[PDB]
Each structure stands twice: as structure tokens, then as C-alpha cells.
Amino acid sequence: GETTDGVYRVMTRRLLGSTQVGVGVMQEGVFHTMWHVTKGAALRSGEGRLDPYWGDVKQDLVSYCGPWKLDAAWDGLSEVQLLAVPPGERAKNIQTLPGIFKTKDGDIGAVALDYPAGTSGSPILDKCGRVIGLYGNGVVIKNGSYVSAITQGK
Amino acid sequence: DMYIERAGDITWEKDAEVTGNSPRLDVALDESGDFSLVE
Ligand SMILES: O=C(c1cccc(F)c1)N1CCNCC1
């Protein structure tokens, strides 16, 4: 199976044709995605199997083949890039300055970019190319636009 | 039954499309992992 580092599409052949349900990051032999994309189910890569290793519905995260490897964080000041992987469309970087999700348990970065539901799991990067979180879990405002949290493991 | 396909490298791209605003929002995270707006 393919274990090369990078961004991957998460596909299914259960519905009409091939449908993209989300995106994930392969790093250090571990596949990272959002929980709502796979629901904790096993994955396929060629003729190889990817079994879940760690999952958490509250954080909306899941790792396959090993523990969560992504530990970089948004510095709270600089612009970041969403490496969006939309359905049927090429991988595209979009630079933005994150807003903030203020919660009773602390502040979290948030990116105000709207993409199809199948784009969930696309990495958000810092200026060094490090993954500081996954895109795809957030909220909808008055204007109908979508604001995703910058969701990082822990 | 789900499968994965490589879609690219993870790299920062100099002079990529710069868009999106930075809103400050009071939010709540429930036991199901869903965010909701607070007012
Ligand atoms: O995969 C993780 C994890 C999850 C989120 C962040 C993190 F750094 C690590 N596990 C499973 C095995 N050890 C306990 C936690």
C-alpha cells in the first residue's frame, strides 16, 4: 500500500460512482483524518489495510496505524495556508489570517474559508509547511458562510 | 468500504491566493463534537 507522506483523498464506492467523503494527512507512517469523515471505519490503500489506532468523537479526530503525530500549533499572529483538496479538483493552497473560537475551555484558531463537505480533513499549515491542524469542524454564521476550527490532536 | 488516493505534497506555496476574514466568535463544543454559536 501507499505510505508516502502527503495529503490524501478519502473515497467510497458505496454511493453513485466514486464519492470523496474527506481528506487526510499521511505523516510518519500514520494517517490522520477527522472522525466524521470515516466514522472510525477501516481504510484501504491499494491492497493494504489501514486499521484505526486512536479516535475521539469530541475532538473529531482519528489516526490510523499509530498514534497522532501532528503537534505543531498556530502561533496566534501569522497567516496560515489551507491546503484544500476539494472533490474532483486539484490540491489548492489558500492563504488566510485565522480568526478565533473563544470557548469556556480556551481560545482556538479558526479559518473563514468555505468548501464542500468532502473537503473535511484538509491540512492547515504554518510558514514551515508544518501541519498545525485539520479543516472541517466548525460553525455557520448569519451570512451563511462557514468558519472551521483549526483542530489539532489534544 | 473506504479507500485513499494521494493528492499532493504538504508544502507552503509562496504567493498563493490570499482570501478570508478573521472573525472572533464565542462558541460552545458539545459532547458530540459539534460547535455552536453563543450570543
Ligand atoms: O494517538 C494518540 C494521541 C492523540 C492526540 C494527540 C496525541 F499527541 C496523541 N494517542 C493514542 C496512544 N497514546 C495516547 C494518545
Q: Cell numbers of A136, please? A: 472541517
Q: Which residue has the cell 460552545?
A: B28
DSSP assignment letter at A127: T
CB pairs A-B closer than 8 Å: 154
Distance, in angstroms, between A54 CA and closest chain B CA? 16
Cβ of residue A28 lying under 6 Å from some atom of ligand 1: no
User: What does this entry list as its resolution, in Å?
Assistant: 1.7
Experimental method: X-ray
Centre a 10 Å sphere on the Cβ of residue A153 and count the other Cβ atoms it contains. Answer: 18
According to DSSP, the residues that pair with B36 across neighbouring strands are B28
Report CB contact under 8 Å: A139, B25: yes
**Taking CA B19 as the corner, what is the angle to CA A154 and CA B23, rounded to the nearest 5 degrees?**
55
From A58, A102, A110, select the one nearest B27 (Cα to Cα): A102
Distances (CA, A) of B25 to A70, A103, A143: 25, 9, 14
Contact by Cβ (8 Å): A137, A60:
yes
Any atom of ligand 1 within 6 Å of the Cβ of A74: no
Within 8 A of A90 by CB-CB distance, chain B residues are 7-8
Domains and CATH numbers, chain A: 6-64 (2.40.10.120), 80-149 (2.40.10.10)
Q: What's the distance, CA A44 to chain centroid?
A: 18
How many other CB atoms are there within 10 angstroms of residue A111's CB atom? 24
How far is the C-alpha of B10 from the C-alpha of B12, rounded, in Å? 7
**Closest C-alpha to A126, from A55, A84, A75:** A75
How far is residue B16 CA from its own chain's centroid? 17
**Burial A53-90, CB ≥16 within 10 A → b, else e:** eebeeebbbbbbbeebbbeeebeeeeebbbbbbbbeee
Residues 6 or more apart from A132 whose CB is under 8 A from it? A70, A72, A73, A74, A80, A109, A124, A125, A126, A150, A152
Inter-residue contact B9 to A84 (CB < 8 Å): no
User: What whole-number distance in Å separates Cα of residue A139 and Cα of residue A112?
Assistant: 10
CA distance A111 to A136: 10
Q: How many Cβ atoms sit within 10 Å of the Cβ of residue A121?
A: 31
Residues from chain B that touch A9, judged by Cβ atoms under 8 A, are 4-5, 7
